[PDB]
Symmetry: C2
């Protein structure tokens, strides 16, 4: 069930956000969905964190040069290697949480990579990406909220 998985993806992302800190916390958390996705329809309706902060969601282009300043979070879909490189050049130097919908590979690119097929959603963490991202991640994430 795609709608059911989409709802689980929303819940997992909210769980993850709760463990992440930005150097200057926004009043409104900006989420950008970038590239082809199956499970982002829930995200795109927008969400609210338990702490009361709204999550505003927009779909944006891979080649938008301002992803780094428009987004606090990027939910990255199924893009090719060149598109991936372009996205992360745009994010370089900006404090951006990155999560990929798929996780067949999680050694290049996103901080977390979801595995949405199967019984429950799981994820892999890319420690090198986390170290370079500019956001702070609580080890408790590395889903129950903080």
């Amino acid at each position: 069930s795609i709608e059911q998985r989409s709802n689980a993806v929303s819940q997992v992302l909210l769980g993850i956000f709760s463990y992440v800190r930005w150097p200057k916390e926004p009043a409104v958390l900006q989420l950008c969905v970038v590239g082809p996705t199956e499970y982002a329809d829930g995200l795109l309706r927008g969400m609210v964190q338990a702490n009361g902060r709204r999550v505003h969601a927009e779909r944006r282009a891979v080649d938008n040069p301002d992803l780094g300043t428009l987004c606090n979070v990027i939910y990255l879909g199924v893009v090719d290697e060149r598109e991936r490189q372009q996205v992360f050049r745009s994010l370089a130097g900006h404090p951006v949480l990155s999560i990929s919908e798929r996780g067949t590979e999680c050694s290049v690119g996103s901080m977390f990579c979801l595995n949405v097929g199967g019984p429950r959603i799981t994820f892999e963490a890319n420690l090198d990406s986390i170290a370079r991202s500019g956001v702070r991640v609580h080890p408790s994430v590395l889903l129950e909220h903080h």
Copy 2:
């Protein structure tokens, strides 16, 4: 700059355009459209559409490994699938009158009947003449001139 919104609305309009040239052996009261696999430009169609004749187009996302795509869908809008998944989808559609359109790809000769090219100045599409010839849905030949 690339506009995901403009491209998404353009895709919706192109799909409606293509539908206008197609007839099903038993015309459904509501055209059922299935969005299958990761997509970038389907957010608009997923809100639902209406043909010029008043028939509603209902859209739902369905799983690539859903065995019943053939009876659930009148139209499939196909996102990113690898060759093994692609074959699974079209095995599910075999024997059913289903119009297939792919969002993106390098080749339009296996699988989907129409292949969109959403990049560039305007949306264009290719027609897969072999898939079209094998399909149980009927495509009026005049659509093939709009193909580029």
